[PDB]
Enzyme design. Structure first.
Site, PDB file in Angstrom:
ATOM      1  N   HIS B 170     -23.007  40.097 -61.907  1.00 22.38           N
ATOM      2  CA  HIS B 170     -22.287  39.912 -60.681  1.00 22.38           C
ATOM      3  C   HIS B 170     -23.058  40.545 -59.570  1.00 22.38           C
ATOM      4  O   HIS B 170     -23.126  40.005 -58.468  1.00 22.38           O
ATOM      5  CB  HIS B 170     -20.871  40.517 -60.753  1.00 22.38           C
ATOM      6  CG  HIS B 170     -19.999  40.160 -59.585  1.00 22.38           C
ATOM      7  ND1 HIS B 170     -19.512  41.071 -58.677  1.00 22.38           N
ATOM      8  CD2 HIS B 170     -19.529  38.948 -59.186  1.00 22.38           C
ATOM      9  CE1 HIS B 170     -18.778  40.372 -57.776  1.00 22.38           C
ATOM     10  NE2 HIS B 170     -18.759  39.079 -58.043  1.00 22.38           N
ATOM     11  N   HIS B 174     -24.903  38.154 -56.277  1.00 21.22           N
ATOM     12  CA  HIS B 174     -24.692  38.337 -54.870  1.00 21.22           C
ATOM     13  C   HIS B 174     -26.014  38.556 -54.199  1.00 21.22           C
ATOM     14  O   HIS B 174     -26.180  38.200 -53.034  1.00 21.22           O
ATOM     15  CB  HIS B 174     -23.771  39.525 -54.538  1.00 21.22           C
ATOM     16  CG  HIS B 174     -22.325  39.225 -54.800  1.00 21.22           C
ATOM     17  ND1 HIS B 174     -21.492  38.632 -53.876  1.00 21.22           N
ATOM     18  CD2 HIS B 174     -21.559  39.438 -55.905  1.00 21.22           C
ATOM     19  CE1 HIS B 174     -20.273  38.517 -54.464  1.00 21.22           C
ATOM     20  NE2 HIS B 174     -20.265  38.992 -55.695  1.00 21.22           N
ATOM     21  N   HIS B 201     -17.622  32.036 -59.205  1.00 24.40           N
ATOM     22  CA  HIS B 201     -16.428  32.825 -59.279  1.00 24.40           C
ATOM     23  C   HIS B 201     -15.400  32.119 -60.101  1.00 24.40           C
ATOM     24  O   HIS B 201     -14.632  32.753 -60.821  1.00 24.40           O
ATOM     25  CB  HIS B 201     -15.856  33.169 -57.894  1.00 24.40           C
ATOM     26  CG  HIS B 201     -16.742  34.148 -57.177  1.00 24.40           C
ATOM     27  ND1 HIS B 201     -17.898  33.806 -56.511  1.00 24.40           N
ATOM     28  CD2 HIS B 201     -16.633  35.500 -57.058  1.00 24.40           C
ATOM     29  CE1 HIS B 201     -18.428  34.958 -56.028  1.00 24.40           C
ATOM     30  NE2 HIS B 201     -17.695  36.014 -56.334  1.00 24.40           N
ATOM     31  N   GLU B 306     -15.820  32.626 -47.924  1.00 22.25           N
ATOM     32  CA  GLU B 306     -16.358  33.857 -48.440  1.00 22.25           C
ATOM     33  C   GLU B 306     -16.138  35.028 -47.524  1.00 22.25           C
ATOM     34  O   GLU B 306     -15.543  36.015 -47.951  1.00 22.25           O
ATOM     35  CB  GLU B 306     -17.865  33.775 -48.739  1.00 22.25           C
ATOM     36  CG  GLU B 306     -18.406  35.029 -49.428  1.00 22.25           C
ATOM     37  CD  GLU B 306     -19.884  34.814 -49.715  1.00 22.25           C
ATOM     38  OE1 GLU B 306     -20.384  33.691 -49.435  1.00 22.25           O
ATOM     39  OE2 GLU B 306     -20.534  35.768 -50.222  1.00 22.25           O
ATOM     40  N   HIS B 321     -12.074  36.098 -48.238  1.00 25.51           N
ATOM     41  CA  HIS B 321     -12.428  36.607 -49.535  1.00 25.51           C
ATOM     42  C   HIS B 321     -12.887  38.025 -49.449  1.00 25.51           C
ATOM     43  O   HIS B 321     -12.400  38.889 -50.180  1.00 25.51           O
ATOM     44  CB  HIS B 321     -13.586  35.822 -50.175  1.00 25.51           C
ATOM     45  CG  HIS B 321     -14.141  36.473 -51.411  1.00 25.51           C
ATOM     46  ND1 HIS B 321     -15.129  37.432 -51.388  1.00 25.51           N
ATOM     47  CD2 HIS B 321     -13.837  36.290 -52.725  1.00 25.51           C
ATOM     48  CE1 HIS B 321     -15.374  37.777 -52.678  1.00 25.51           C
ATOM     49  NE2 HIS B 321     -14.613  37.109 -53.525  1.00 25.51           N
ATOM     50  N   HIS B 325     -11.369  42.026 -50.848  1.00 27.62           N
ATOM     51  CA  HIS B 325     -11.942  43.087 -51.624  1.00 27.62           C
ATOM     52  C   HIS B 325     -11.762  44.384 -50.897  1.00 27.62           C
ATOM     53  O   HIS B 325     -11.395  45.392 -51.496  1.00 27.62           O
ATOM     54  CB  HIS B 325     -13.444  42.898 -51.899  1.00 27.62           C
ATOM     55  CG  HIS B 325     -13.726  41.873 -52.960  1.00 27.62           C
ATOM     56  ND1 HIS B 325     -13.967  42.182 -54.279  1.00 27.62           N
ATOM     57  CD2 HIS B 325     -13.796  40.516 -52.880  1.00 27.62           C
ATOM     58  CE1 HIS B 325     -14.170  41.009 -54.928  1.00 27.62           C
ATOM     59  NE2 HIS B 325     -14.078  39.970 -54.120  1.00 27.62           N
ATOM     60  N   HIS B 361      -9.304  36.323 -57.161  1.00 21.56           N
ATOM     61  CA  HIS B 361     -10.224  35.227 -57.276  1.00 21.56           C
ATOM     62  C   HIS B 361      -9.524  33.966 -57.661  1.00 21.56           C
ATOM     63  O   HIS B 361      -9.965  32.881 -57.288  1.00 21.56           O
ATOM     64  CB  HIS B 361     -11.394  35.520 -58.223  1.00 21.56           C
ATOM     65  CG  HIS B 361     -12.359  36.439 -57.537  1.00 21.56           C
ATOM     66  ND1 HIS B 361     -12.167  37.797 -57.394  1.00 21.56           N
ATOM     67  CD2 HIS B 361     -13.518  36.156 -56.884  1.00 21.56           C
ATOM     68  CE1 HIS B 361     -13.212  38.261 -56.664  1.00 21.56           C
ATOM     69  NE2 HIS B 361     -14.060  37.305 -56.333  1.00 21.56           N
TER      70      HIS B 361
END
Lengths: 626, 626, 626
Positions: B170, B174, B201, B306, B321, B325, B361
């Site tokens: 992961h 990115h 994802h 995103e 998104h 987080h 997600h």
């Protein structure tokens, strides 16, 4: 230093004709060659013929193989003694261009090395004669222009066909992309060489057609039928090497079988290419089929057609293009019983001068066109760059939107090429077409919020047909000539992009003379392409007419991000023409098919209808000055 | 050599923290960083937060800008001293991945660089303790497995969530596709990054769901409602660099506004996005509308959601998104009055461990799904590959059609990441899921006369629901996980294609350790993914159960000619892992939508009904070994 | 490119003081140094002290060892963080000078790097103060000249002693010939370094003496007796690094034992050198005796006296010269209980300013002289070059045979050395001695039939003594200063050789400022010597007096064939001073003993009597302009 290196190379190039007299008193000495060494010195070297190419390739490999530059000079020095001189120049130039060690180095001028190919026999004779006539250090100048009755209207085109720069370019281009090129041996590969082969030749034809129209002549017709007799052409070129000259051709000659390969073979190969197209797939040697895929398809065809070593099948497909040059070249003596030299068609330096060249190349271009025809047309999606709008274009010159063209006198120095003797310099004066400098101003509106990157593509196409004024885009595709391609960044809001003609991506900014090279300049140091390749600058636009012929000026902007994946390598260095030449040891910098948007069929009746928002047409005039 | 270049970069990154102490007496000295100089060293770096990303982008650009590799090392050396370390690792890794001087330069393994993120605090401080407890060269080994009361069933999933390989992947993904990525600056663009964002994802969620079902747990539910309280999770991770650790979160408190963003804004951004999907167009900054085209739509949505720099509108659509987080990460101290560190959600390396990750997600995945819903379903025409019939598939293992899964012990070397002191090596032992190797044998009948080229696509989906056994293809779409995609050529007649699990396109074949790298590796001279990304191999199939859970094995063959794109890219480079990672500096190799045939709605009640002749389902069992 | 390389080097040199704050958070990291790392940052570095030199040598070796230039930059960058800064500059400069990779490269100016050493504390304070006083981009200029009551006549000499160029040269010379130099490690050896050590220092003393006489002061007396108290000197220099400064010395101080080594030791070593001379042979470590051979003898002595690593015995012989600097430097606090910094004597950059320097160096020079005394004098045979006769010499200036000297103002830019802050530049203005340009015309008669090659040697010596006018050649030997040495070819018959002062072999033509270096010039690219070393040009002739002091101008021609065996290597490239500096990585180009014909005892009462036919003396006047 590099300068020293340059100096060493120039002498490899001097007195090539003379360099003969092998003088290695035992034949056995070169066991390395014990069953080869086949084409004698005096003989003419053919760029097209397979056997000649094979020898040439063998030579290059040795040069490439040379461990170091010093070793390179040594073998070259020795090889030049035995091998035919033409082959030698060819092999060496290729070596200089590619071999790293030669990170130093121009090649001596082709025109300068072989002045006899560039200028007429009369002028050459006169210079030689003057040299002998009165011995004196004094310089000799001869004006090549002559005086004669001009029977043929084809003569009008001579400014284009005969141009020194054009011939030189053609020589150089073949050097950068040799047919013989074997990627395994070199290790490196020439990107899209097959496609480039297609594009470059197509452009030459297209440019040629613009000249005819400027002249008021109709477009050249392809040499479709093998049976038809050819028009004659007499080159009036001598080879200083010997007393012999390129044989002239009268008209009325249909093409004869040669011992080497025959007209029937040409047909076969033509039927054969066609099948592969129809079946969507060509037969490799393995008897596997490879599809004539979207991007790939032109490249594969180019290799087969030329044909290069790269051709997927040489034995089914043959080498149509090259044989055409050979067959036409020795039309006069197919049998070779006469023992006459071949015509201009045999050499890359000379071939452009003969009008037949265009007929054949249009024929081959047609082959490519059929392939292009199979592809689907371009949607608005492909063409358009959204958010960008082209407001207008203007060309600035003495008079706006008019470009003026005239004839300029120039001199060529013979001394490096032919034995000078006492004289300091012998120069021949010739005249060539030239145009006034101009700039383009394009106003673009960037609707988007952020700065965009665009590739500006500019082309020129004739407005008038042979019947009357008719901008039929389908036809225009053949005619369109590429003026320039460059990257620009646009900010939001209105932008004005100015570019000067001098900057043109199509043309060579300057070719250094053996004299300049005698000192040491800093364009940088790359090779055979250096000053050589690129289309000549004077040539950038067609002659036009005194009346001021109308041409469509087309400017299109495309998304650069789209256009370049990678491939912005060497800057303004030695060579400077990407549009026709590509980039040294890096990709031709553009994703789009060469000739885009023009390459595919256009549905619309008129060009204007074709335009998207990121395209624009401005009509300008080209007027020649007598 | 390139491997010597490795050996320098690895000790550049080795022990980040202590290489801080900026030690440049005047702040002005680094004018190069006068634009930034906002986030201190010790602070935690957020992969999601916009401001942090901006700094990171600024750093990368400098690294990209570096004229040569040596210059690259220099700025990096000195920049590391001043910038926050997390940001630094992020910026450097991006640079290494893209910048052409760097091919064959892997990065220091993330797990190895920051062992504290991978292993629990107890085995961090035990190991550190042992180092101090008795000084001795002798090696220290610590078993991370622990002993504890396992109150929460979520714990069962820990093998998946906690897996070292998954977290590492992961992180790497990115890096290959940074949100900050600006195509203009780099010049190159990441093909279909928005879509890939969606696909990767989605797969993680899908794979996660298969674990729950294997576990006997129901599928994860999306975090649709902002109001609902979150389940708690305590990571037990320490950050050695400081005293600080990732703050744990208990359950049961609704959502709090941060200074940076309010929850209401998040809701807005969602309604905004939903509307656009609905009316089938999005509004650009220019206030122009761009259609959610079938081809383009997922990509455009991905960038907006995103959101990346690529988003057509940031100031209307926001960055849903990423903010999710951030908001979840600092739930404990939205105010930051506490001055507590953020939770695992803040970091790409850690985020997978928290169960909340899946809830969020899935929520975002839902957004994509609505878009997919708008698209029409697939006709037989699209799916079928005529003339090809799939006779049968078999999986070979110890027992045919059964795959066995077990737990394997492994060790991680801490020494590169944390100060070793006297000890030669400190290794922590952990356990992970693993499965026996297996192969697939697919029998295909090629009815056609000629050889065909097919792309074989293999997916795995759970047979059982939460209720009872029901192969409802609509539902299955969420669950299906991609096992493999590869090209094969079929001759006429019967063919058997065998593929081994090891070859799987989804997984990374091997990650080299620091030790491996010091030894060295070699590829061609260009720039690539730093031996990285790809799903971990042990992870390829779900755990299953001791009973041997039933899964549908789906194999589909499609026409490769259609599937592939033509273009000219590189040598054999990081393409092992194409399914989730893509190819280095290349366009995504498959024309089909990612997840095809599963991406669009399926009309049929049962999966079997869906099958065309070039598709096949084989039921296999996965049985775990205790 | 080289230019890029230059750029990288300049920053190694910037903000050295600041560069400290080691910030490598674990001491263990450099296991490479686990029992070394001994002199802290702030402390003053001694060029003379053995322990300091040892560290310096260790540093250089690492730099030499660096595999490539990039590696070189890296270690340097890292090393500079920990090591004392002075040592660092020393080690790096040596590396730049010798290491091939550095075929690129000047070193940043010493004066510019450490402006505080060149200019007085007051000026430095003012500049710093002005910077703070009013913030503004505007430039600051400070005139260093001051205003004060001048008690001591020694002050008169300050133009010579304090000169920036002189100090810089001394720094550079030690760099080219380091005492620490180990030929085995480098592999290369410095030809005749011991002898050069002797010659260079002797010249400095000789030149100094000419200044005193110009002043009307008597010649300096050697510091023969250890017991005698020293004259005091206060440097008024601050170290910007810290608040501390070079400690001043009052008079009345006899030399004190230091913990390190003691006065008695100095005596021992002196008694010890003498024995070896008397016994015609020195005791190597092996206890073998090596003769003080003709050519060799000075070199061996030089190594022992300095002493260098090259000394045949360090443990019997010691290091007299270096200890002298150390002892004098810490006269103020021999015990170091005071924890006061050392005086100017400690540094090669500063040491020339203190008048004590001359006393000590004359003392050491005396040692060499005793050795020279043992050698026999020169016969006519050795001196004469037959067939060549020197008719006359003339010096051309504004007024023939008169040279004019004046004071010129100059500015030094502080900004590279000290923190500039807001200001663009802070320059300090200082004044130095300078003279009008002049040329020499020598008429020589070549009696021989063939062309000859001659080395022209030109020296200047004072006519007047302290009693009255007495050209006693024995005494003159100490005084004679070398103006120039060059090769010329003479044809038969009369010849006139003209040489310009600018061409002088003794002086550095130009030192490039960090600013010039910021761009990229082409003197060529060699190193620490580049613009640095060479004696300064303004300094070429003594001040003289307003009256026009009389000096003997001596020109001698010798057989070049005799003089150079080999050793005409690099041309006018980066460094340009052979007479005092030698040639880069090639021999000092002259067979003759340095200082010939002056080195050996002269029997004659008057200089004129000494002259052979290939020698000539012209009396010229030097007049200073107030």
């Amino acid at each position: 230093t590099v300068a020293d290196k340059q100096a060493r190379l120039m002498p490899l190039f001097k007195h090539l004709t003379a360099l003969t007299r092998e003088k290695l008193p035992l034949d056995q000495r070169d066991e390395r060659l014990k069953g080869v060494g086949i084409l004698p010195r005096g003989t003419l070297f053919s760029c097209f013929h397979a056997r000649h190419l094979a020898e040439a390739t063998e030579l290059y490999v040795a040069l490439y193989g040379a461990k170091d530059f010093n070793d390179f000079i040594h073998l070259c020095e020795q090889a030049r003694q035995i091998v035919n001189e033409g082959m030698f120049v060819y092999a060496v130039s290729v070596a200089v261009l590619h071999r790293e060690d030669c990170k130093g180095i121009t090649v001596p001028p082709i025109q300068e090395v072989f002045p006899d190919r560039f200028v007429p026999a009369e002028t050459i004779n006169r210079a030689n004669k003057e040299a002998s006539n009165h011995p004196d250090q004094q310089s000799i100048v001869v004006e090549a222009e002559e005086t004669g009755n001009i029977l043929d209207p084809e003569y009008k085109l001579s400014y284009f066909r005969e141009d020194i720069g054009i011939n030189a370019h053609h020589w150089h281009w073949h050097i950068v992309y040799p047919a013989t090129w074997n990627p395994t041996v070199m290790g490196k590969e020439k990107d899209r060489k097959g496609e480039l082969f297609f594009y470059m030749h197509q452009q030459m034809c297209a440019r040629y057609d613009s000249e005819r129209l400027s002249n008021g002549l109709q477009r050249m017709i392809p040499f479709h039928n093998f049976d038809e007799p050819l028009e004659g052409y007499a080159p009036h070129l001598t080879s200083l090497v010997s007393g012999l000259q390129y044989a002239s051709r009268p008209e009325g000659y249909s093409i004869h079988d040669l011992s080497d390969v025959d007209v029937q073979d040409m047909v076969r190969w033509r039927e054969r290419i066609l099948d592969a197209i129809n079946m969507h797939y060509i037969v490799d040697k393995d008897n596997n089929k490879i599809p004539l895929d979207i991007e790939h398809g032109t490249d594969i065809l180019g290799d087969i057609i030329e044909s290069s070593d790269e051709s997927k099948n040489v034995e089914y497909y043959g080498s149509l293009h090259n044989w055409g040059h050979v067959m036409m070249a020795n039309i006069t003596d197919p049998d070779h019983r006469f023992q006459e030299n071949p015509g201009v068609m045999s050499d890359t330096s000379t071939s452009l001068r003969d009008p037949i060249f265009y007929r054949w190349h249009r024929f081959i271009d047609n082959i490519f066109q059929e392939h292009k025809k199979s592809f689907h047309p371009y949607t608005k999606e492909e063409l358009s760059f959204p958010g960008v709008e082209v407001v207008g274009v203007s060309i600035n010159s003495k008079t706006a939107n008019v470009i003026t063209t005239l004839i300029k006198e120039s001199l060529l120095e013979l001394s490096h090429g032919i034995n000078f003797g006492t004289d300091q310099s012998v120069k021949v004066k010739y005249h060539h077409l030239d145009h006034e400098p101009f700039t383009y101003n394009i106003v673009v509106e960037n609707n988007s919020g952020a700065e965009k990157h665009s590739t500006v593509r500019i082309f020129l196409a004739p407005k008038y047909d042979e019947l009357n004024n008719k901008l039929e885009p389908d036809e225009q595709r053949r005619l369109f000539i590429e003026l320039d391609k460059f990257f620009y960044t646009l900010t939001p809001g209105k932008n004005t992009i100015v570019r000067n003609h001098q900057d043109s991506s199509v043309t060579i900014s300057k070719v250094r003379t053996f004299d300049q090279l005698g000192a040491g300049e800093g364009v940088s140091e790359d090779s055979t392409e250096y000053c050589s390749c690129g289309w000549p600058e004077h040539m950038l636009i067609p002659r036009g007419s005194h009346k001021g012929m109308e041409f469509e000026l087309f400017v299109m902007l495309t998304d650069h991000d789209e256009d370049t994946v990678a491939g912005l390598s060497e800057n303004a260095v030695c060579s400077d023409a990407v549009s026709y030449c590509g980039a040294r040891d890096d990709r031709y910098p553009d994703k789009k098919a060469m000739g885009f948007p023009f390459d595919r069929k256009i549905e619309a009746r008129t060009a204007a209808e074709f335009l998207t928002p990121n395209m624009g047409l401005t009509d300008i005039k080209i007027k020649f000055h007598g």
